[PDB]
Scaffold this active site. Structure first.
Site, PDB file in Angstrom:
ATOM      1  CG  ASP A   1      -2.335   0.791   0.726  1.00  0.00           C
ATOM      2  OD1 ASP A   1      -2.358   1.671   0.179  1.00  0.00           O
ATOM      3  OD2 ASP A   1      -3.322   0.371   1.564  1.00  0.00           O
TER       4      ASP A   1
ATOM      5  CD  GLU B   1      -7.632   8.065   5.048  1.00  0.00           C
ATOM      6  OE1 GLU B   1      -6.378   7.643   5.794  1.00  0.00           O
ATOM      7  OE2 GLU B   1      -8.121   9.245   5.659  1.00  0.00           O
TER       8      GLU B   1
END
Ligand SMILES: OC[C@H]1O[C@@H](S[C@H]2[C@H](O)[C@@H](O)[C@H](O)O[C@@H]2CO)[C@H](O)[C@@H](O)[C@@H]1O
Ligand SMILES: CC(=O)N[C@@H]1[C@@H](O)[C@H](O)[C@@H](CO)O[C@H]1O
Ligand SMILES: *[C@@H]1O[C@H](CO)[C@@H](O)[C@H](O)[C@H]1NC(C)=O
Ligand SMILES: *[C@@H]1O[C@H](CO)[C@@H](O)[C@H](O)[C@H]1NC(C)=O
Length: 602
Positions: free
Chosen positions: A285, A491
């Site tokens: 990521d 997120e």
């Protein structure tokens, strides 16, 4: 002058081995490096032998850019890559997670939680297919999807990116994979990567593993669960992904019982690679290796060591590429990371690039540009949106006339609420910007617009965003449609311990419904405190984050199709119950998983 790796008639593995044996250490580490377009230039690409580029959320050539502008940008970067000594094409990645959603004019499909409500894996396949075409329209060959997280706590800011709290539904929706990539051949070996060709994209099963199981739904946090529960809840859909030839897997920021996934050799190498036999590439990521340490970035040398030794193949740097390449070169030069690990990473990356056809079609197809926002795809999104809707209430008492479906012909109707005419709110996060945005951010149809498109020409439609109780009582309305809910988030910004919708939402519903019979359309990324909204409402629909095609909402309101969606998550009575999932011992839901009222088409 024949070079076997450049011969399209040769087997992928022969081409991979042929190219690998010619490469310098610099060329190899280059392949393992993915950088943001924001830091890319033709010399950077060429001089550091860069393997991949991405756009993060909102990373676009300009606001409003056309499909051709995107093709020209991607091709500009590819030209520089192709000009290196070996001419290895880059692969360009983007978060096309509900359509090609960074792109102006792209079809925006319902987010994953709504798709779980459809229980329709073939619909999700078709959405994969359409999404691939709209990604290729912009010259991009790689989509960071699907998110196969099994969200176990709706307090998580990414719970909308999970198809369900039930791994079985998530497993069924891995059909996105062969939609994005094409169907694997009859003979196919589970764990091999596959992409059909230049009209398809490489996919990414993310984020490995247990991203949906973190404590209190805290994003990027710790998932505390024994191996049996990890393997029973969070892992299964990764095996489905292997069986469908997913090309890449992205590692989670999260930890499992205290161990950072980005440093977990046992799971990344021991399990994903050596047990599931994954042969595509593993990608970090975004600054995922930096976040191995606390504070993040405080020992980048260790970040590189630990991640590459864990088995990661490509690093989403995405900015500090000179430091990444310098540090990894030093590690290899000092014997801290063996050449065998570098070679394995590069073999994987090349395997994907060769398999997908990237050496044969490194450049965009300008004929594909017109795929962006195509009406056939919007029609599919409209179908998905309608199928995603969950009817929670349709009458205050069991003796009332059912409110839905509403009649298209009425003298005067009211459309109200913060979410009735706001395209950005109905799309949510990962739309145009990373966090999503408010208002008319792209091409689509709001709920107000869809009501106006649906109703009889004699029906007068009044919009008021937040009317008071007298306004409604005085208006001579036959009924109202009132839309409220969550603002866009992505997120960590979506992590939310109270799960109550922002005001005015409830107050508008109460004013509207207090004056006239009302259908409340709740836009959210997850279950939210709903008893007060229900108490006020004649009818209430959980519409999730339905995307650009608001007509899917009115298709069901007005009875063109019956409601068929079923909750893909538990609806809690109170956040103090959480976590609370289907199958737990103390299961006391407001609405259980699978719940949904139906109507018949009129
Ligand atoms: O977009 C790539 C990758 O991102 C992470 S979150 C990522 C945003 O796009 C980035 O632009 C912003 O500055 O940082 C955030 C993370 O802090 C995400 O987990 C993953 O699904 C996505 O593919
Ligand atoms: C207009 C309407 O609500 N129709 C019906 C419902 O009463 C019935 O249970 C079912 C049987 O087909 O189909 C639906
Ligand atoms: C979880 O979150 C807390 C803040 O609540 C933080 O201090 C801790 O580092 C996090 N743990 C992990 C494994 O990310
Ligand atoms: C709930 O939490 C959110 C997000 O963390 C916050 O912005 C909002 O103000 C909170 N709502 C209440 C009622 O405290």
């Amino acid at each position: 002058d024949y070079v076997l790796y450049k011969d399209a008639t040769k087997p992928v593995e022969d081409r991979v081995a042929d190219l690998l044996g010619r490469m310098t250490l610099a060329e190899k580490i280059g392949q393992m490096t993915q950088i943001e377009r924001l830091v890319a230039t033709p010399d950077v690409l060429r001089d550091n032998f860069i393997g991949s580029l991405l756009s993060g959320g909102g990373s676009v050539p300009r606001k409003g850019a056309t499909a051709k502008e995107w093709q020209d940008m991607v091709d500009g970067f590819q030209k520089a890559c192709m000009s290196t000594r070996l001419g290895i094409p880059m692969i360009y990645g983007i978060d096309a997670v509900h359509g090609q959603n960074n792109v102006y004019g792209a079809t925006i499909f319902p987010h994953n939680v709504g798709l779980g409500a459809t229980r329709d894996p073939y619909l999700v396949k078709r959405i994969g297919e359409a999404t691939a075409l709209e990604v290729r329209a912009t010259g991009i060959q790689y989509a960071f999807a699907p998110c196969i997280a099994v969200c176990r706590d709706p307090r998580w800011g990414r719970c909308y990116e999970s198809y369900s709290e039930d791994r079985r539904i998530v497993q069924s929706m891995t059909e996105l994979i062969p939609g994005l990539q094409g169907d694997v051949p009859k003979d196919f070996t589970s764990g091999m990567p596959f992409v059909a060709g230049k009209n398809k994209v490489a996919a990414c099963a993310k984020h490995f593993v247990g991203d949906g199981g973190t404590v209190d739904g805290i994003n990027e946090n710790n998932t505390i669960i024994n191996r049996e529960g990890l393997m029973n809840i969070h892992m299964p859909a990764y095996k489905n992904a292997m069986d469908k030839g997913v090309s890449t897997v992205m590692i989670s920021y999260s930890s499992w019982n205290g161990v950072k996934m980005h440093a977990n050799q046992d799971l990344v190498t021991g399990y994903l690679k050596d047990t599931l036999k994954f042969k595509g590439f593993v990608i970090s990521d975004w600054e995922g290796i930096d976040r191995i340490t606390t504070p993040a970035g405080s020992d980048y040398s260790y970040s590189v060591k630990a991640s590459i030794l864990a088995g990661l193949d490509m690093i989403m740097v995405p900015n500090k590429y000179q430091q990444f390449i310098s540090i990894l070169t030093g590690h290899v030069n000092g014997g801290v990371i063996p050449m065998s690990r570098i070679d394995d990473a590069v073999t994987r990356i090349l395997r994907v690039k060769f398999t997908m056809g990237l050496f044969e079609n490194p450049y965009a197809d300008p004929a594909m540009a017109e795929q962006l926002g195509k009406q056939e795809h919007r029609d599919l999104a409209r179908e998905a949106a309608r199928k995603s809707l969950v009817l929670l209430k349709n009458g205050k008492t069991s003796t009332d006339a059912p409110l839905l479906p509403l009649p298209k012909k009425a003298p005067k109707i009211l459309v109200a609420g913060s979410h009735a005419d706001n395209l950005g709110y109905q799309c949510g996060g990962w739309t145009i910007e990373h966090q999503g945005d408010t208002g008319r951010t792209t091409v689509g149809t709001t709920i107000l617009e869809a009501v106006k498109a649906a109703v009889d020409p004699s029906t007068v439609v009044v919009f008021a965003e937040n009317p008071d109780a007298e306004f409604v009582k005085s208006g001579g309305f036959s009924y109202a449609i009132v839309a409220v809910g969550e603002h866009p988030y992505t997120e960590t910004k979506g992590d939310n311990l109270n799960l109550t919708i922002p005001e005015p939402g409830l107050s508008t519903v109460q004013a509207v419904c207090g004056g006239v019979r009302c259908a409340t359309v709740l836009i959210s990324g997850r279950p939210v405190v709903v008893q007060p909204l229900l108490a006020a409402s004649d009818a209430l629909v959980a519409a999730w984050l339905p995307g650009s095609e608001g007509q899917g909402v009115t298709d069901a309101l007005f009875g063109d199709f019956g409601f068929t969606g079923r909750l893909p998550r538990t609806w809690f009575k109170s956040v103090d119950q959480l976590p609370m999932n289907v199958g737990d011992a103390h299961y006391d839901p407001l609405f259980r998983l699978g719940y949904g009222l139906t109507t018949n088409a009129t």
